[PDB]
Amino acid sequence: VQYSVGEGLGPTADFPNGRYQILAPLGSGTFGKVVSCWDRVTEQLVAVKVIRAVRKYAEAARMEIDILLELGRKDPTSRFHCVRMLSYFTHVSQQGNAHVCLVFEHLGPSLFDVLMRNHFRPLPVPILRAVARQLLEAITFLHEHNQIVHTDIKPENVLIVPSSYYPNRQITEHVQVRLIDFGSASRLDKVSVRHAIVSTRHYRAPEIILGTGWSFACDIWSFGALLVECYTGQTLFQSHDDLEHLQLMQKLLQHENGEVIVPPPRPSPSSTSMGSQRRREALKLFRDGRLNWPEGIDEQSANSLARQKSIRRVARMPELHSIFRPEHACLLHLIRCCLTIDPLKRWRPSELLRHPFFMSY
Numbered sequence: 001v002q003y004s005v006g007e008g009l010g011p012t013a014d015f016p017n018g019r020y021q022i023l024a025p026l027g028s029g030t031f032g033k034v035v036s037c038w039d040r041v042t043e044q045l046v047a048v049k050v051i052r053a054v055r056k057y058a059e060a061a062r063m064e065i066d067i068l069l070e071l072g073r074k075d076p077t078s079r080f081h082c083v084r085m086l087s088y089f090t091h092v093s094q095q096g097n098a099h100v101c102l103v104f105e106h107l108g109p110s111l112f113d114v115l116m117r118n119h120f121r122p123l124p125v126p127i128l129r130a131v132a133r134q135l136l137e138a139i140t141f142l143h144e145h146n147q148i149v150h151t152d153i154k155p156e157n158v159l160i161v162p163s164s165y166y167p168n169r170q171i172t173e174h175v176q177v178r179l180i181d182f183g184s185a186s187r188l189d190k191v192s193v194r195h196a197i198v199s200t201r202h203y204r205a206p207e208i209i210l211g212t213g214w215s216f217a218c219d220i221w222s223f224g225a226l227l228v229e230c231y232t233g234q235t236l237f238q239s240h241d242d243l244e245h246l247q248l249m250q251k252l253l254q255h256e257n258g259e260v261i262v263p264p265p266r267p268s269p270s271s272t273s274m275g276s277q278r279r280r281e282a283l284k285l286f287r288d289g290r291l292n293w294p295e296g297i298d299e300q301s302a303n304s305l306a307r308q309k310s311i312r313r314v315a316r317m318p319e320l321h322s323i324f325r326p327e328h329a330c331l332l333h334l335i336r337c338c339l340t341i342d343p344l345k346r347w348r349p350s351e352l353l354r355h356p357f358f359m360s361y
């Protein structure tokens, strides 16, 4: 439903027109819309995330509510940089539509907002380091103190604490950030390996595409991607095709020791599991163990313009080592610890927090 500035949300006795009054738009996503609100009870600014009137996003929102209850219980000050959820309710519409609403602390713009406002110019390395350290602290918190995996590490889900922000709208190395959006997170304390399609495309780890089971390590891959983005201001993997995405991965890391896209083990024909179906769809992308690129881009067409554009796009993809200037060699190594095709090779976030890129500063 379309919402305008001035309308209310969450009606109570003292405020029959809504406890939370809309002041400004804050953000949007497939889940719904996040709106800046004035809490008529506490007379403070809050951020109300309203979920779309769909069942799947409602389940996701309830999972986010549960996880954020646990996270606010185990860290109320938010020493580990996770967004504080103040409240949650259900707003009914004039048409009978029920929307889940989560009330969070009011934060500033996203890291994506920062990158856009500066015309996608590369983020300086010291600010990059501050943000990466705090984000890595949050990921360490989740993974190792809660056995929770986020799966949606993206620049849109890292927000600036407004106290660090300034009216000149230029962040410094003292910026404070918070990780948000736990509507896709999963607890791995009982089942640590999953096979469902998760992660935003551009930050999706290869094991998720290939079907060899993902776990905590996938977040690290996303983290790595994000870092490269912050170094260049540009999205690393710009593709929505699985074959092209895996080829871009292979190209970015071709001259990295031991990084080759390998197909999953072929399951039995009498296997109906979600993982086996993903593995079959993934094997459909390979020919004799090699990634069917570029001939697989347009199989039927012998002379295709889409295949030629895919060839050009993969050629434009740089080798990882060539992206970074020499003086930033350390950062390169840090990202090598994250952008590995085998999830078993990626470092733990606690180990990454002890990398020279951080503890030599």
Ligand SMILES: Nc1ncnc2c1ncn2[C@@H]1O[C@H](CO)[C@@H](O)[C@H]1O
Residues within 6 Å of the ligand: 026, 027, 028, 029, 034, 047, 049, 083, 104, 105, 106, 107, 108, 109, 110, 156, 157, 159, 180, 181
């Ligand atoms: N607490 C918050 N403060 C400010 N913006 C937020 C908050 N939570 C979510 N958003 C915005 O809504 C979207 C969340 O996916 C992003 O665009 C993000 O900037």
